[PDB]
Amino acid sequence: EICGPGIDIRNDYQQLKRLENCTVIEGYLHILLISKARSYRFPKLTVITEYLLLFRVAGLESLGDLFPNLTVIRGWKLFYNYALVIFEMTNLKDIGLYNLRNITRGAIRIEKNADLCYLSTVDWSLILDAVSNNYIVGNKPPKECGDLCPGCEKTTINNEYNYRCWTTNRCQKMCPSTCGKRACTENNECCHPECLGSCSAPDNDTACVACRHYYYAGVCVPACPPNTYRFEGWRCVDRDFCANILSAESSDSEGFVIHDGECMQECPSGFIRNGSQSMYCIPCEGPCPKVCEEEKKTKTIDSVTSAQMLQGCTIFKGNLLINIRRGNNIASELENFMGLIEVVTGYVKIRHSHALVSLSFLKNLRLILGEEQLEGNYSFYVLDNQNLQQLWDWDHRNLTIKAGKMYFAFNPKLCVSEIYRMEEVTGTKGRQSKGDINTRNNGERASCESDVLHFTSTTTSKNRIIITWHRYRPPDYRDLISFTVYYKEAPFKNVTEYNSWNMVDVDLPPNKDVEPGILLHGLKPWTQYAVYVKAVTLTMVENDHIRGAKSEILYIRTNASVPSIPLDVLSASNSSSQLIVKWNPPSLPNGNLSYYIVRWQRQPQDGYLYRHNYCSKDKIPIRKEKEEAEYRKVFENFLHNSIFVPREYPFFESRVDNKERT
Amino acid sequence: SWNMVDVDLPPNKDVEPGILLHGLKPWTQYAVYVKAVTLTMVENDHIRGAKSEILYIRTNASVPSIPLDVLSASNSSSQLIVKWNPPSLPNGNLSYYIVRWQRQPQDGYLYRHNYCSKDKIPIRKEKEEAEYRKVFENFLHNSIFVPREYPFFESRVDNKERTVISNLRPFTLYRIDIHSCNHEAEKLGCSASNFVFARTMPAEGADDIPGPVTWEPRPENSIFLKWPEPENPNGLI
Amino acid sequence: GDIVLTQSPATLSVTPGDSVSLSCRASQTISNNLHWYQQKSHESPRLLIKYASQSISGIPSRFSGSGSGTDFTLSINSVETEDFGMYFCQQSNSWPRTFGAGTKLELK
Amino acid sequence: TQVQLQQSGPDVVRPGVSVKISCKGSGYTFTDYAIHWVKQSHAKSLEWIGVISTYNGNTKYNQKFKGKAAITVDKSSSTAYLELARLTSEDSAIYYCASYGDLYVMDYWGQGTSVTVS
Ligand SMILES: *[C@@H]1O[C@H](CO)[C@@H](O[C@@H]2O[C@H](CO)[C@@H](O)[C@H](O)[C@H]2NC(C)=O)[C@H](O)[C@H]1NC(C)=O
Ligand SMILES: *[C@@H]1O[C@H](CO)[C@@H](O[C@@H]2O[C@H](CO)[C@@H](O)[C@H](O)[C@H]2NC(C)=O)[C@H](O)[C@H]1NC(C)=O
Ligand SMILES: *[C@@H]1O[C@H](CO)[C@@H](O[C@@H]2O[C@H](CO)[C@@H](O)[C@H](O)[C@H]2NC(C)=O)[C@H](O)[C@H]1NC(C)=O
Ligand SMILES: *[C@@H]1O[C@H](CO)[C@@H](O)[C@H](O)[C@H]1NC(C)=O
Ligand SMILES: *[C@@H]1O[C@H](CO)[C@@H](O)[C@H](O)[C@H]1NC(C)=O
Ligand SMILES: *[C@@H]1O[C@H](CO)[C@@H](O)[C@H](O)[C@H]1NC(C)=O
Ligand SMILES: *[C@@H]1O[C@H](CO)[C@@H](O)[C@H](O)[C@H]1NC(C)=O
């Protein structure tokens, strides 16, 4: 009688009756918030896969009162690396599991049991493996307990040797030395190697309380027979069993898969279901496609959590509604979730997305169908995006809208030419109406074609950079002109335009012979900075030809300086006449490390020592809130005024060209 | 740090535009106001928006959390002081606490063993464990406490998080159940209990002989010493 | 969306002894995940053909399935006086499971 | 083989009432096979409405019947149940119990339960 896949008994103490017939509990067992008010005893139960949890059970004095024959807790799935949790159990006096033999996986958590004795009387080192990670705190103090086994055997705990027992009447059962890793019957006759725990009969597959590997047809097999597959982690089932198993109900819930001789819930990472919902997984090349299916026909992306549900999807069976008013780093965060979406079965609506200046986060999206379209047969519908400068329609990208039209309205920063280039790749030239794309309220503030600002001279220090660009006469004589310098620390050159950019506004100088420049204040020595200037053309006469000026992203690295001292010098001696020494690279290298230079000087044997008469002494010497980081910083600042130019006891000098060890 | 959501005007003219807010903290005042988005096909003339007043809506109250970190000591016999911290999620006005103390029986056996043979006689006076303890706090929601072998004594603490228990048996263990209620706990039900165990101070001079020792000669060269038993010992002689 | 199974013709007037063939076409491609069922009058439908072609132990040799992909056919070599009923095809590759409209095999 | 499925008797109930249909397994391991439910009316013909896995207890419904049907199981009694609330004249049909197969095929079928809404 297998019970599962999870027993959760709580509140009602009579609800414990669900264990009348269970001999094995497939899955965890929860006995919580029970208030006992005749007793209940379950000698049928012997094995529990996964873990066992007990919490706030009043009236229960010993665990032997419930599960006396419990032998193996497999711990296939653990409660936070714990296979047995006994927490806040009142009236409990001892762990009465006197038939417990092997806990295959996980640790034990025994906490807050003011009456729990017989803890030190149990040698947990022979029933489980990871005894180091066990948690036994807050129980009855051993000083005020009084553990006394009836009157059995005993063994060594640390350097101590004391008796072992589970309760006041039963002792801790052990196996003789001759069986080794094997198991033993109550009468100390070795159990079949594939057995585990006890035996109904010595050396027999069909006489086992619990198998150590797997189970099938009453036999403890090492591996499952050829036509059976591993289910959970203890028994073998046939193929027709897993064709009837159904996972937890979800939007895309399906049956179980057969893979690598195991019957699991979903195909593992790097695998996809062969065919159409078949029982077997096939290796998928590179990235494995995850089609995402949702109950809501129109998924609305109005926050950052809503986008997390589309993480890793390749195809979307539904409609996408983007509505992003707020968000700083969402331009790169949406690309994490939606960057792999390639096909959309429905339509895409970009409404009120003021935070989006572009749609580049929708990478790999190359197909939009039109199974359902907005009123008026629209498959692409943007509206009221006060900052949408460009689409994701770079001339490198690919796109195909199968059916539907495109409507654009109230997008002022979007150049009207960009959406004409869209329907080229989209393939909907002439399919839209005359009002679907209008130059009114669209591209009103757009500055499409821009000029080029040319840098003229750059000068570098260890912390300052002077850069000057050419004077820029605006396209119209009456425009007021000003500049804006964008500079930010960029370790490498792949940089996106404005974002943690530092900005400063410098005006065009009055004298026409001097060109506009800017001086940067405090920069890190030897650090590559990305700089580009942008013009501010305030046109008194609006539109006609809105024309800005933008420069290329210039990468300027400051000079190098004196490096920092090496960090944490440690040294040891593995042999006489030899000294190993390791360290860490300095805090502020300020350039390429190139090499280290180490020096070792012999130290004189201590003064005096030769002088004292050590036959009179009794001991002769031998030899082998927290702002302290700011304190140590002061002493590192002192080491800048003194450097080292390389070339009684003499110094020996050697160069280490690569590693931090010598 | 405003949370924003866009709801459209409903198509049917008889139903008025509304919005449903998803997951909010129980008993929490929220500032809400709606703003209209008027996309004018004809620009300017009279740019006119619509804005509402800032409406403050507080959600309902719920079952409180268990009191935090119950500590107890004994400054005198028949007295027990005990302090705690307000619950993590009160979900309303705390109003008062309700504490219960139950006498614990002196340990089973102990009376049974012959302690003249023993050598030691007993006496008495990376880190995700917050997520682990959260699971056990979630369990305490399905069971509440409706207020009104050893009997429970029940007292209400109306203000502070400290209280002193009176009239106790000296050197006896006590189960101290502490709950946390709120202003709506008379219908929602008062919270679960975070309990602790504490023993009182020993009654000074109560475990010595209360009378004189008498002797009577008996057969062989024997003497029978007779003395009275201490009526009220500290725990047990 | 769902998968619709269109069974044509809706009714076949047959004389006992004639060989007939039923057809069940699908919207999307089903490859192999199609099954057949026979339902006589005032009975429950019983399985005839698993996975488009392979037959069931018990059903007579007259019933045979064919097709793979989008067009599937059920053949009956010599209809008997017992085979007069209504026949369905079952979709089985994508949720939800859907059936055909049904083809009645009545007496001509 | 001795496999058989026995469903509850016919029902004739007024509109707006809730009803549930039983289906007891026999001659087979009840926990090893899922149970499907199929609605056969005059219109729409055979409509698969849901399947329940007898092992774990999880279900999968047809979206046309999620807010209308509810499939439960009884491991001890070896019986499944198909609940139907706010019954309409449309729901007046014969419902079938199917098992002894898998999530893909319905090998054996129960005799059917006639629900008539007056
Ligand atoms: C409980 O039984 C399990 C399985 O029988 C034991 O797991 C063994 O763990 C060691 C660790 O290195 C492996 O080398 C063995 O191969 C495992 N056994 C098997 C059969 O594969 C576990 O040691 C047992 N624990 C105790 C306390 O006896
Ligand atoms: C920062 O580095 C630049 C070179 O990248 C230095 O410019 C050189 O200065 C030396 C002066 O000793 C001249 O001999 C070189 O001809 C200069 N090279 C170039 C390309 O101009 C600059 O001096 C460094 N800054 C400081 C403060 O030393
Ligand atoms: C949340 O609080 C409101 C009151 O602020 C509750 O509304 C009351 O509900 C009770 C039902 O027992 C009625 O008797 C009262 O007349 C209601 N008062 C008002 C002003 O409407 C509301 O029920 C509470 N929410 C929940 C879930 O209990
Ligand atoms: C357990 O076994 C008994 C027979 O001893 C049976 O009557 C009962 O239905 C079974 N199941 C439960 C949950 O008790
Ligand atoms: C730039 O390229 C480097 C290395 O190729 C990579 O680590 C970094 O994430 C890239 N950054 C951007 C913004 O592309
Ligand atoms: C510093 O190291 C980088 C990385 O190898 C190299 O590209 C660069 O040229 C080096 N700089 C100098 C001055 O050698
Ligand atoms: C809760 O306490 C606040 C502060 O004293 C008070 O203003 C409010 O009225 C109280 N609520 C109730 C329901 O008594």
Side-chain angles (χ1 to χ4, degrees):
Chain A
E1 171 64 25
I2 307 176
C3 297
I7 316 298
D8 187 293
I9 308 174
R10 65 179 61 193
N11 293 96
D12 285 321
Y13 55 95
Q14 193 78 354
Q15 199 175 126
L16 209 73
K17 202 185 183 185
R18 296 156 59 180
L19 310 170
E20 284 186 283
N21 305 328
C22 306
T23 175
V24 186
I25 292 185
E26 205 168 31
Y28 59 88
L29 171 57
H30 287 185
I31 303 181
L32 280 59
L33 309 181
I34 299 300
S35 56
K36 282 189 173 183
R38 269 289 181 172
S39 302
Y40 275 77
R41 191 171 185 264
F42 306 107
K44 317 268 188 174
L45 181 57
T46 55
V47 190
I48 290 184
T49 58
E50 305 186 25
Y51 58 89
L52 158 66
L53 201 155
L54 298 149
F55 176 68
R56 294 221 186 187
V57 180
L60 186 65
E61 294 187 349
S62 180
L63 287 196
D65 306 10
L66 300 179
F67 321 106
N69 298 24
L70 179 56
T71 304
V72 175
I73 292 184
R74 222 171 202 88
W76 188 60
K77 298 309 155 192
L78 303 169
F79 187 91
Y80 298 153
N81 303 330
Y82 294 115
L84 171 61
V85 179
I86 297 180
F87 181 48
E88 280 202 317
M89 286 278 305
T90 180
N91 301 123
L92 196 68
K93 294 180 300 180
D94 55 287
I95 302 94
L97 307 176
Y98 43 73
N99 281 324
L100 189 61
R101 287 307 209 97
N102 178 308
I103 290 183
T104 316
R105 182 180 179 180
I108 310 300
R109 179 126 184 178
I110 295 178
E111 189 179 12
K112 289 268 172 290
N113 312 285
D115 289 53
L116 203 61
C117 278
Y118 291 85
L119 269 50
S120 304
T121 77
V122 183
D123 186 290
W124 306 92
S125 58
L126 56 87
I127 69 107
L128 67 100
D129 302 324
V131 196
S132 58
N133 302 280
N134 289 334
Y135 195 85
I136 296 92
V137 197
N139 297 278
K140 196 174 194 181
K143 40 199 171 186
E144 181 54 70
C145 165
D147 287 320
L148 177 57
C149 303
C152 43
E153 287 190 356
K154 63 180 180 182
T155 182
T156 60
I157 289 188
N158 303 331
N159 310 339
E160 302 175 348
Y161 32 90
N162 213 327
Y163 273 61
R164 306 286 154 256
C165 59
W166 286 96
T167 180
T168 179
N169 297 332
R170 295 86 176 181
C171 287
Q172 182 163 339
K173 301 185 177 184
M174 300 174 60
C175 286
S177 308
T178 58
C179 301
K181 301 102 173 184
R182 308 156 193 83
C184 66
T185 320
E186 171 187 25
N187 277 338
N188 295 253
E189 306 295 320
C190 299
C191 285
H192 188 279
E194 280 291 336
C195 211
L196 181 58
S198 172
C199 282
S200 310
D203 196 80
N204 200 23
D205 291 333
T206 58
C208 280
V209 182
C211 305
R212 62 172 60 251
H213 280 270
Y214 278 94
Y215 172 87
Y216 177 75
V219 186
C220 295
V221 293
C224 296
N227 275 15
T228 61
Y229 316 98
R230 306 180 301 268
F231 186 56
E232 302 298 298
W234 69 284
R235 74 187 185 109
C236 307
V237 301
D238 60 316
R239 53 189 60 178
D240 275 335
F241 185 76
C242 295
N244 289 267
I245 309 179
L246 196 59
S247 64
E249 181 174 3
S250 302
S251 301
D252 50 329
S253 171
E254 292 183 357
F256 279 18
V257 293
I258 308 175
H259 184 66
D260 198 17
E262 187 186 352
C263 157
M264 45 201 300
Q265 189 172 220
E266 301 170 338
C267 291
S269 60
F271 279 100
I272 194 61
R273 310 178 76 107
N274 174 32
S276 302
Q277 293 185 358
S278 297
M279 302 288 299
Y280 308 98
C281 314
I282 178 82
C284 20
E285 77 287 20
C288 292
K290 257 67 177 182
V291 179
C292 291
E293 191 183 45
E294 206 182 81
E295 318 167 27
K296 302 178 181 180
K297 316 158 191 174
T298 61
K299 181 56 165 64
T300 302
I301 306 291
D302 64 333
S303 65
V304 295
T305 305
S306 59
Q308 187 179 356
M309 299 178 178
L310 292 179
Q311 187 172 11
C313 306
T314 181
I315 308 175
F316 187 66
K317 270 278 189 174
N319 310 324
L320 287 182
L321 173 58
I322 305 298
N323 185 90
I324 307 175
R325 293 181 176 268
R326 195 173 164 84
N328 192 22
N329 53 8
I330 53 97
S332 58
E333 184 63 279
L334 298 159
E335 192 169 329
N336 176 33
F337 309 112
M338 307 177 185
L340 277 69
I341 275 76
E342 290 184 320
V343 182
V344 172
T345 61
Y347 65 96
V348 174
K349 184 174 182 181
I350 318 288
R351 172 195 60 185
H352 299 329
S353 300
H354 301 292
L356 299 183
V357 301
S358 176
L359 269 59
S360 62
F361 60 97
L362 291 176
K363 283 185 176 181
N364 301 272
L365 178 67
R366 303 179 182 92
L367 289 177
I368 296 182
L369 279 70
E371 182 180 4
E372 185 182 9
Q373 301 173 13
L374 193 49
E375 193 182 32
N377 289 274
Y378 294 98
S379 187
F380 199 85
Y381 193 103
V382 304
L383 180 61
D384 191 26
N385 306 278
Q386 289 200 233
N387 293 276
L388 198 56
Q389 294 180 344
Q390 67 180 13
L391 295 84
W392 61 281
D393 181 29
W394 288 70
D395 282 20
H396 309 72
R397 293 298 306 273
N398 195 332
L399 174 61
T400 297
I401 289 185
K402 189 266 175 183
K405 296 187 298 297
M406 303 184 304
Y407 180 80
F408 293 74
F410 288 82
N411 307 309
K413 280 298 182 178
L414 210 171
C415 276
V416 69
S417 63
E418 202 79 7
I419 67 192
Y420 297 137
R421 316 304 169 91
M422 186 193 187
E423 56 183 359
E424 297 178 346
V425 185
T426 297
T428 58
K429 47 180 181 181
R431 266 165 62 174
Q432 289 79 15
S433 175
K434 306 174 183 178
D436 297 11
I437 289 87
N438 61 326
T439 70
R440 293 173 280 261
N441 68 66
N442 277 11
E444 183 176 350
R445 296 193 300 271
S447 61
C448 312
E449 299 290 349
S450 59
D451 291 334
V452 180
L453 290 168
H454 299 90
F455 291 129
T456 314
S457 64
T458 64
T459 310
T460 59
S461 285
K462 66 175 183 178
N463 37 25
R464 314 175 196 266
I465 299 184
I466 290 185
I467 180 173
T468 58
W469 53 100
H470 193 272
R471 296 187 65 97
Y472 179 70
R473 302 296 162 176
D476 193 288
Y477 295 91
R478 304 174 180 178
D479 293 353
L480 195 152
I481 176 62
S482 183
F483 295 96
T484 300
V485 182
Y486 297 78
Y487 70 98
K488 78 171 182 179
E489 184 171 338
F492 207 56
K493 311 177 169 177
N494 47 323
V495 174
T496 66
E497 294 82 0
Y498 187 91
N499 287 270
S500 63
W501 281 90
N502 290 272
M503 296 162 293
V504 62
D505 288 332
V506 59
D507 299 329
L508 186 67
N511 183 263
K512 301 178 181 178
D513 289 325
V514 300
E515 53 184 0
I518 188 59
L519 163 66
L520 305 182
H521 285 76
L523 280 55
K524 300 173 175 58
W526 191 270
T527 305
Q528 191 177 55
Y529 289 88
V531 183
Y532 72 92
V533 295
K534 185 193 299 181
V536 184
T537 58
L538 296 184
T539 61
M540 296 266 295
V541 187
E542 191 266 341
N543 196 333
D544 302 337
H545 264 61
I546 308 182
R547 212 184 193 98
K550 191 171 185 174
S551 177
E552 68 168 5
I553 302 180
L554 175 58
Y555 301 109
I556 312 178
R557 182 183 297 276
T558 61
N559 289 87
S561 60
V562 172
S564 176
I565 54 176
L567 294 181
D568 310 324
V569 174
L570 305 182
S571 52
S573 187
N574 292 327
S575 169
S576 58
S577 301
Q578 280 188 354
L579 267 175
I580 70 105
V581 47
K582 58 184 179 182
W583 58 93
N584 298 327
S587 181
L588 310 179
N590 302 339
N592 282 339
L593 291 172
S594 295
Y595 61 87
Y596 292 82
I597 177 79
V598 298
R599 300 194 306 163
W600 56 97
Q601 183 192 35
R602 289 186 49 179
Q603 284 302 100
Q605 298 294 345
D606 283 335
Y608 272 37
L609 202 73
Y610 298 71
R611 175 184 178 270
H612 300 165
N613 190 290
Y614 287 87
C615 281
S616 306
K617 314 297 181 181
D618 188 77
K619 292 248 182 177
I620 45 184
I622 51 181
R623 179 65 169 87
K624 288 187 175 181
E625 276 288 72
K626 187 167 187 174
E627 57 185 358
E628 292 186 352
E630 175 174 72
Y631 170 87
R632 293 180 176 86
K633 175 196 174 184
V634 185
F635 292 88
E636 267 196 349
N637 301 333
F638 289 143
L639 296 175
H640 270 248
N641 268 16
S642 294
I643 59 181
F644 176 78
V645 184
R647 292 296 179 88
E648 288 294 324
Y649 269 104
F651 267 95
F652 290 159
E653 206 162 329
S654 70
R655 262 190 278 260
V656 184
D657 265 335
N658 191 84
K659 308 176 183 179
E660 285 78 13
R661 296 168 175 257
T662 179
Chain B
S1 63
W2 281 90
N3 290 272
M4 296 162 293
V5 62
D6 288 332
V7 59
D8 299 329
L9 186 67
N12 183 263
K13 301 178 181 178
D14 289 325
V15 300
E16 53 184 0
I19 188 59
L20 163 66
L21 305 182
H22 285 76
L24 280 55
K25 300 173 175 58
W27 191 270
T28 305
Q29 191 177 55
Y30 289 88
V32 183
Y33 72 92
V34 295
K35 185 193 299 181
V37 184
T38 58
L39 296 184
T40 61
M41 296 266 295
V42 187
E43 191 266 341
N44 196 333
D45 302 337
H46 264 61
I47 308 182
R48 212 184 193 98
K51 191 171 185 174
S52 177
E53 68 168 5
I54 302 180
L55 175 58
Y56 301 109
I57 312 178
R58 182 183 297 276
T59 61
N60 289 87
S62 60
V63 172
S65 176
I66 54 176
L68 294 181
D69 310 324
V70 174
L71 305 182
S72 52
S74 187
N75 292 327
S76 169
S77 58
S78 301
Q79 280 188 354
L80 267 175
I81 70 105
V82 47
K83 58 184 179 182
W84 58 93
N85 298 327
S88 181
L89 310 179
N91 302 339
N93 282 339
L94 291 172
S95 295
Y96 61 87
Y97 292 82
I98 177 79
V99 298
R100 300 194 306 163
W101 56 97
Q102 183 192 35
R103 289 186 49 179
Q104 284 302 100
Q106 298 294 345
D107 283 335
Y109 272 37
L110 202 73
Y111 298 71
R112 175 184 178 270
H113 300 165
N114 190 290
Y115 287 87
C116 281
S117 306
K118 314 297 181 181
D119 188 77
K120 292 248 182 177
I121 45 184
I123 51 181
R124 179 65 169 87
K125 288 187 175 181
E126 276 288 72
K127 187 167 187 174
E128 57 185 358
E129 292 186 352
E131 175 174 72
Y132 170 87
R133 293 180 176 86
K134 175 196 174 184
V135 185
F136 292 88
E137 267 196 349
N138 301 333
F139 289 143
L140 296 175
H141 270 248
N142 268 16
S143 294
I144 59 181
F145 176 78
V146 184
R148 292 296 179 88
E149 288 294 324
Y150 269 104
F152 267 95
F153 290 159
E154 206 162 329
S155 70
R156 262 190 278 260
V157 184
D158 265 335
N159 191 84
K160 308 176 183 179
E161 285 78 13
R162 296 168 175 257
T163 179
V164 186
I165 306 180
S166 60
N167 300 16
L168 309 170
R169 204 159 185 173
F171 202 81
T172 51
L173 196 65
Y174 276 85
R175 158 93 167 277
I176 301 181
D177 276 25
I178 297 188
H179 312 72
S180 60
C181 314
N182 53 23
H183 62 276
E184 283 297 274
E186 295 182 342
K187 187 178 181 180
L188 285 160
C190 188
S191 166
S193 56
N194 180 25
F195 58 93
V196 82
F197 284 96
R199 184 184 303 268
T200 52
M201 297 272 278
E204 191 187 303
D207 49 351
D208 50 26
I209 304 304
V213 180
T214 64
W215 68 274
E216 298 151 352
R218 296 210 172 178
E220 313 285 351
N221 299 273
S222 307
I223 294 293
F224 188 89
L225 294 179
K226 174 187 175 184
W227 63 95
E229 182 172 53
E231 294 186 354
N232 307 324
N234 291 331
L236 176 66
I237 294 298
Chain C
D2 290 15
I3 286 187
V4 285
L5 293 177
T6 59
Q7 291 188 305
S8 56
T11 300
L12 284 159
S13 292
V14 187
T15 301
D18 304 330
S19 304
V20 82
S21 297
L22 281 69
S23 183
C24 160
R25 306 161 187 262
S27 55
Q28 293 184 345
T29 63
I30 327 294
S31 175
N32 192 32
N33 264 309
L34 193 82
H35 319 298
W36 289 88
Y37 295 91
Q38 180 196 68
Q39 182 186 21
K40 301 188 188 64
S41 182
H42 301 81
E43 288 185 10
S44 300
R46 74 175 188 178
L47 182 64
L48 287 186
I49 299 298
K50 264 179 183 291
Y51 293 86
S53 57
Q54 42 168 296
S55 298
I56 296 302
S57 178
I59 64 110
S61 58
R62 304 179 296 266
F63 303 86
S64 61
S66 304
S68 180
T70 180
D71 298 336
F72 298 81
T73 50
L74 174 70
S75 303
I76 299 182
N77 295 330
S78 175
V79 178
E80 303 287 343
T81 56
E82 54 163 344
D83 301 329
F84 284 103
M86 200 171 183
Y87 297 79
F88 300 86
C89 57
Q90 184 210 288
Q91 144 75 4
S92 174
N93 93 87
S94 69
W95 296 107
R97 302 292 170 265
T98 63
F99 287 91
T103 291
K104 183 172 182 179
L105 199 65
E106 53 172 84
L107 187 59
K108 181 157 57 182
Chain D
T1 177
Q2 285 287 318
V3 57
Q4 65 176 1
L5 303 182
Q6 307 185 47
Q7 306 182 212
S8 63
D11 293 327
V12 177
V13 291
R14 297 180 181 178
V17 198
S18 182
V19 77
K20 62 166 53 186
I21 300 175
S22 63
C23 173
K24 186 173 183 178
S26 161
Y28 75 103
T29 308
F30 185 84
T31 69
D32 275 18
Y33 293 93
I35 291 183
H36 304 262
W37 286 103
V38 172
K39 168 180 179 179
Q40 185 183 43
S41 57
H42 299 266
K44 297 289 185 177
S45 290
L46 292 177
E47 314 176 50
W48 177 93
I49 68 185
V51 57
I52 180 161
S53 182
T54 44
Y55 161 68
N56 51 36
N58 292 123
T59 54
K60 183 159 201 61
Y61 292 86
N62 193 318
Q63 268 298 306
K64 305 172 178 297
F65 298 86
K66 181 55 183 179
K68 190 74 171 187
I71 309 180
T72 54
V73 79
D74 197 337
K75 298 184 180 183
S76 59
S77 181
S78 298
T79 305
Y81 301 94
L82 176 64
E83 182 178 355
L84 293 174
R86 62 195 79 87
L87 287 169
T88 326
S89 57
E90 167 199 336
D91 296 79
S92 57
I94 284 186
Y95 302 93
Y96 284 108
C97 186
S99 181
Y100 204 71
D102 51 335
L103 304 179
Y104 309 104
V105 199
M106 317 173 198
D107 300 355
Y108 203 86
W109 291 63
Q111 78 279 21
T113 296
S114 176
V115 179
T116 298
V117 190
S118 301

